[PDB]
Structure 1
Amino acid sequence: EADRTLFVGNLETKVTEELLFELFHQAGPVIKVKIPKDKDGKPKQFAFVNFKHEVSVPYAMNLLNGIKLYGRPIKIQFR
């Protein structure tokens, strides 16, 4: 579970889980995505994405990082 997960940060306001799911479906099978919302009413600037296969987590990092969505790149990290 944890190994196949992938943490994300620097997501713009309009970035919804649907956009991330669509983007990462191409990278690999996207199990699901999390955008926890703190005591602010909107999801935090970070998120989590779960891939079916661990092989996606490297390849996705090898493929996507700092992608300019909504005029802001997106950073990708691990646990």
Structure 2
Amino acid sequence: ADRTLFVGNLETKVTEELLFELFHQAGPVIKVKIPKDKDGKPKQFAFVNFKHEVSVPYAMNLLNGIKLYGRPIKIQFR
């Protein structure tokens, strides 16, 4: 839980599979999770858990603000 990023401002069509492939460019990714509504539907953010800590500052610089389906993601850390 020290190598995890918060990716907000996600467009409705962004899936976990898309973010994994995107953040994998910053290093091996253990898993991605878009939390689902209390009644099943995705929320508009994901948690991206890297294997290595260095992927965190690398991923932020590399991908912060990148547009997915027109909407720029917002990366935060802790």
Provide runs of 4+ in structure 1 moved above 4 Å.
Answer: none
Equivalent position of 1:49 in the other structure:
48
Q: What TM-score comes out, normalization by structure 2 length?
A: 0.92
SS of the equivalent of 2:52 reads coil
Alpha-carbon offset, residue 40 of structure 1 = 5.2
C-alpha displacement at 1:24, in angstroms? 0.8
The two structures have a TM-score, normalised by structure 1, of: 0.91
CA distance in 2, matches of 1:76, 1:29: 18
Q: Deviations over 1:43-73 (max 9, x none)?
A: 1011100100000000111211111110100
Q: Which residues of structure 2 form unaligned runs of 5+?
A: none
The runs of 5 or more residues in structure 1 that have no matched partner are: none
- The corresponding residue for 1:38 is 37
Percent sequence identity is: 100
The structure with more strand, counted as a fraction of residues: 2
Deviation of 1:3 after TM superposition, in Å, equals 1.3
Mapped to 1, the partners of 2:39 and 2:27 lie a distance apart of 32
Q: Deviations over 1:4-44 (max 9, x none)?
A: 01111011111000000000111110100111111354210
- Cα gap change, 1:35/1:6 in structure 2, threshold over 3 Å: closer, same or farther? same
